[PDB]
Amino acid sequence: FDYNASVVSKGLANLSLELRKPVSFDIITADTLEQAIERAGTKHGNKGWEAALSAIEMANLYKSLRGTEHHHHLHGSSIEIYEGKLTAEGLRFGIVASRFNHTLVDRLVEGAIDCIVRHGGRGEDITLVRVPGAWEIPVAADELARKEDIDAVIAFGDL
Amino acid sequence: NASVVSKGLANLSLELRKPVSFDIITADTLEQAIERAGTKHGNKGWEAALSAIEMANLYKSLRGTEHHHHLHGSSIEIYEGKLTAEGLRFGIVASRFNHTLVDRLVEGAIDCIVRHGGRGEDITLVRVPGAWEIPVAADELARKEDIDAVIAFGDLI
């Protein structure tokens, strides 16, 4: 009656029989306490995922806005639209994080690095800077922002 | 009913001049439940193996070139399997999980094959981690050309 847990079991069971190889299928089982921990963990992961996602869009929007490229139309009605593609290819980024409450903000950083890499961002272009606390961010962020080979800067606070 | 057998053995001891003993066991309220639990599982293993002997012999006669006894009258053929496990090779698949109770079924199914004319040399036992691996393990046993029936014991519900 789940339509998801039943079909996955049927498919794997037939997969092992048809190929004659063991397929150990194990799922999770939580009861009102690991679910809360799991939901808390994924909420932080998404929080840092979208923070790095908007930087990619804004960085591409600036490049397209002040660039010389005839853009596409809404539907073919000649109204050109300027929008930021979610392709972080060729963009260089810089992340500033505070080690205060590092057990949580590191999930924000980890959830932002993979968002850049999966969208085509090369690993050679991401620079991470750690500071003792949020009060050290403005000077550190200023140093990274002045660099010419930096297209966006992401910072994470503490609470 | 229980005193008469003791008297009969006692008279036998004097007649044959040999020490012949007799002993019984008194059961409290708990050991009766323990004894009934063992017998119930032994019967389940006995019946599971019995249902495989009949089907194995049914295939032997169904594909045979010799038809047999008709219905209560005649002119209607009837096919059925005898309970003679002579010359039949078997294969048992059991799960290691809950082995303290699954092994009762296996022991109750081995003697059923033995007491019906089957020798132990034609029995092949295979143990698997859990019930999930039973269908894929019984598949490999059935690939063997020297297997005529497969018995599988799980542990759920």
Swiss-Prot record, chain A:
The main enzyme category here is transferase
Q: Which reaction does it catalyse?
A: (2S)-2-hydroxy-3-oxobutyl phosphate + 5-amino-6-(D-ribitylamino)uracil = 6,7-dimethyl-8-(1-D-ribityl)lumazine + phosphate + 2 H2O + H(+)
Residues annotated as binding 5-amino-6-(D-ribitylamino)uracil are 47, 100-101, 134-136, 158-159
Q: In which pathway does it act?
A: Cofactor biosynthesis; riboflavin biosynthesis; riboflavin from 2-hydroxy-3-oxobutyl phosphate and 5-amino-6-(D-ribitylamino)uracil: step 1/2
List positions binding (2S)-2-hydroxy-3-oxobutyl phosphate: 39
Keyword annotations of the record:
Riboflavin biosynthesis, Transferase
EC annotation from Swiss-Prot or TrEMBL: 2.5.1.78
Q: Thermal dependence of activity in this record? A: Extremely thermostable. Has a melting temperature of 119.9 degrees Celsius.
Show the GO MF annotations: 6,7-dimethyl-8-ribityllumazine synthase activity
Decide whether keyword Transferase is in the record: yes
The record's InterPro entries line, in alphabetical order, gives:
LS, LS/RS, LS/RS_sf
Q: Which GO terms describe its biological process?
A: riboflavin biosynthetic process
Q: Does the keyword Transferase apply?
A: yes
Q: Which terms in the GO cellular component ontology are assigned?
A: cytoplasm; cytosol; riboflavin synthase complex
**Family affiliation:** Belongs to the DMRL synthase family.
Any idea what job this protein has? Catalyzes the formation of 6,7-dimethyl-8-ribityllumazine by condensation of 5-amino-6-(D-ribitylamino)uracil with 3,4-dihydroxy-2-butanone 4-phosphate. This is the penultimate step in the biosynthesis of riboflavin.
How does the record describe its quaternary structure? Forms an icosahedral capsid composed of 60 subunits, arranged as a dodecamer of pentamers.
* HAMAP family, per the entry: Lumazine_synth (MF_00178)
Name of the molecule in the record:
6,7-dimethyl-8-ribityllumazine synthase
Q: List the source organism.
A: Aquifex aeolicus (strain VF5)
User: What gene is this protein a product of?
Assistant: ribH
